Amino acid sequence: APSGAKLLQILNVRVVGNGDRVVVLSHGFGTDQSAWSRVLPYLTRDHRVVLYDLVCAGSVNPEHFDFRRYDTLDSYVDDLLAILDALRIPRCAFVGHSVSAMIGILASIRRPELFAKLVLIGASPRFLNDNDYHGGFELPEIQQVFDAMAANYSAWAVGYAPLAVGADVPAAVQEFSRTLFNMRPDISLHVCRTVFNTDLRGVLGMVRSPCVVVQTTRDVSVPASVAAYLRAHLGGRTTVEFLQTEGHLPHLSAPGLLAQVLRRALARY
C-alpha cells in the first residue's frame, strides 16, 4: 500500500490558507475535493486548510483503487492518517461529509490527540434500520440500489443527483452529477457497498473529540432522528447545528449558510 508521502500525490493533497490552526476537509460519496470550492474562501483567511480526494474519487487514477484494501472504511482512515503524518500535522479540526463523517469518527478513535474537533455533515453511524434504530434503509432496498447501479449506472446517477441535492439548485445538481459520472461505475458501487456494511454505533462512545453535527432540514440518506442519536452516543461533548436549507450537499447548494456554521464550529478548538 502507498506510503503517506506517495498518498500526497495519489490523493491530490492541497494545503491552502494562513496560520497554524489546521482544518482538514474530507468530501463524501460521489464528489471530490472540488465540492469544498465554494466554502473554502470562508476558511482560508483564518485557517490552514488541508484538502484531499478519497481514493474512490473520479479525480484519482483508478489504478490506485485496491478493491481488497478498500472493502473496509478502516483503510480510508489509514490514508487520512498517513497524509496528516506525512504533512507533520500533530493537531487539527476535521470536517467530513457523508462517508467522511464515518472516516472522521474512526480516525478520532485511532488518534485521539490528533483530532481536536470533528464537524460531521450529512452524518450517520449506520444507514440500515435495526429495531429501535432508524437508519433510513431496509436491506432489500440497499440491494435495489446495488442492482440499479450495476444494471444502469448512468440512469441511476441522473435519478440520484437531484434527490441528493434536495433543494432546487440546478447548478448543484449538474455539478454533483458531473463528479458522480467521473467515478468509474464499479468503484462507485464498491464504495457504496462498503458504506452500507459499516455500523459505527458500537464505537461512538470511544470518540473523545468534541463534535458538531450539522443537520439540514431534509437529507435523502440521513433521517432527522440520526443527529439526536449521534449526540446521545458520541463519547465527547457534542452539539447539533441546524442549517435551514434542504439537502445532503449544503456545501454545493447553500455555501454561505454552511460557512456561517463552520466558522462558528471552528472558532475555538
Side-chain angles (χ1 to χ4, degrees), residues 166-266:
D168 182 19
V169 187
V173 175
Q174 281 156 44
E175 261 164 50
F176 183 55
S177 323
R178 177 194 40 99
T179 49
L180 212 46
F181 271 98
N182 289 338
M183 297 179 67
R184 218 172 71 190
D186 61 327
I187 292 175
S188 188
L189 172 55
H190 185 270
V191 189
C192 279
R193 285 185 184 279
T194 299
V195 169
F196 278 109
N197 195 254
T198 308
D199 181 353
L200 297 185
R201 295 176 298 160
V203 295
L204 296 178
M206 313 177 77
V207 175
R208 302 298 151 91
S209 318
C211 299
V212 173
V213 179
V214 179
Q215 181 174 217
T216 64
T217 66
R218 195 131 195 117
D219 184 320
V220 66
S221 58
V222 182
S225 67
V226 162
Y229 184 96
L230 284 170
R231 178 199 252 135
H233 293 275
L234 281 163
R237 156 161 206 87
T238 303
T239 312
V240 178
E241 288 272 357
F242 301 93
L243 271 182
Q244 224 72 2
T245 187
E246 178 168 352
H248 184 59
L249 305 153
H251 49 324
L252 286 192
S253 63
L257 287 178
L258 177 59
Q260 298 188 329
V261 166
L262 296 181
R263 286 194 62 80
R264 266 206 306 283
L266 306 170

Side-chain angles (χ1 to χ4, degrees), residues 80-81 84 92-94 107-108 111-118 209-210:
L80 168 65
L81 298 174
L84 295 174
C92 73
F94 176 95
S108 169
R111 296 280 294 280
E113 294 308 281
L114 175 55
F115 293 93
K117 176 166 270 203
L118 301 179
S209 318

